[PDB]
Write a protein that binds this ligand. Structure first.
Ligand SMILES: *[C@@H]1O[C@H](CO)[C@@H](O[C@@H]2O[C@H](CO)[C@@H](O[C@@H]3O[C@H](CO)[C@@H](O)[C@H](O)[C@@H]3O)[C@H](O)[C@H]2NC(C)=O)[C@H](O)[C@H]1NC(C)=O
Ligand SMILES: *[C@@H]1O[C@H](CO)[C@@H](O[C@@H]2O[C@H](CO)[C@@H](O[C@@H]3O[C@H](CO)[C@@H](O)[C@H](O)[C@@H]3O)[C@H](O)[C@H]2NC(C)=O)[C@H](O)[C@H]1NC(C)=O
Ligand SMILES: *[C@@H]1O[C@H](CO)[C@@H](O)[C@H](O)[C@H]1NC(C)=O
Length: 167
């Protein structure tokens, strides 16, 4: 029962960005499955360079633990704004991180986050928001808006569900 982790953390990235996938920490060869297809990659870390839409999908890893890991889903976008989340499924009590990310890392200003239409009441800083103690109420669909260069943009919406800690 290994686990795929990403670095950076975001599973929603921009076309052309990089993301590294690592199979669990007890592993000191690895088997990777992209959309259920055995990869040619055998190291404990899978590197996705200059992300393609094709790289989107389900990724599972396999170590000498005779049991594949839970899947992880990657999605590549091309837009001016992209709402990134630490997780699309957060356990109650854990933190939830959101980031209104701009294409090419352009600076984003006047960042506003929305949850089910309503603009977030929580207090937050520019383009990086931290929700420390996730609650069932933090479930909802989110998206953000911000000013890039001289115009105002809006990211695609994302759905975030908060489940209970137990099993
Ligand atoms: C793995 O499976 C996923 C299905 O969840 C595949 O993702 C889909 O891939 C396409 C690109 O092939 C994504 O982009 C679309 O492509 C067209 C043509 O290039 C583009 O013009 C559209 O604007 C659109 O972006 C599509 O969004 C994507 N779906 C998701 C949910 O990410 C993926 O390609 C599969 N990879 C392999 C190697 O099988
Ligand atoms: C992200 O979450 C939202 C809401 O949680 C999803 O949109 C909602 O989708 C449901 C169906 O899954 C819509 O309800 C349906 O309405 C039709 C017509 O009245 C009815 O016949 C069906 O029985 C069902 O009740 C609902 O209106 C819609 N809400 C909104 C605000 O659009 C959305 O699909 C999710 N996105 C993804 C990618 O999962
Ligand atoms: C991704 O990594 C490669 C080197 O492995 C680098 O040349 C490229 O600039 C990186 N892409 C981004 C968007 O940083």
């Amino acid at each position: 029962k290994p686990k795929v982790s990403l670095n950076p953390p975001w599973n929603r990235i921009f076309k052309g960005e990089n993301v590294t996938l690592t199979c669990n920490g007890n592993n000191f060869s690895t088997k990777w499955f992209h959309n259920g297809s055995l990869s040619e990659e055998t190291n404990s870390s899978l590197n996705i360079v200059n992300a393609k839409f094709e790289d989107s999908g389900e990724y599972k890893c396999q170590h000498q633990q005779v049991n594949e890991s839970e899947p992880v889903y990657l999605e590549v976008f091309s837009d001016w704004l992209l709402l990134q989340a630490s997780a699309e499924v957060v356990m109650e009590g854990q933190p939830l991180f959101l980031r209104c990310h701009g294409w090419r890392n352009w600076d984003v200003y006047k960042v506003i986050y929305y949850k089910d239409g309503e603009a977030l009441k929580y207090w937050y800083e520019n383009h990086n928001i931290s929700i420390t103690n996730a609650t069932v109420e933090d479930s909802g669909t989110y998206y953000c808006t911000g000013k890039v260069w001289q115009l105002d943009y809006e990211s695609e919406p994302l759905n975030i569900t908060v489940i209970k800690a137990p099993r």
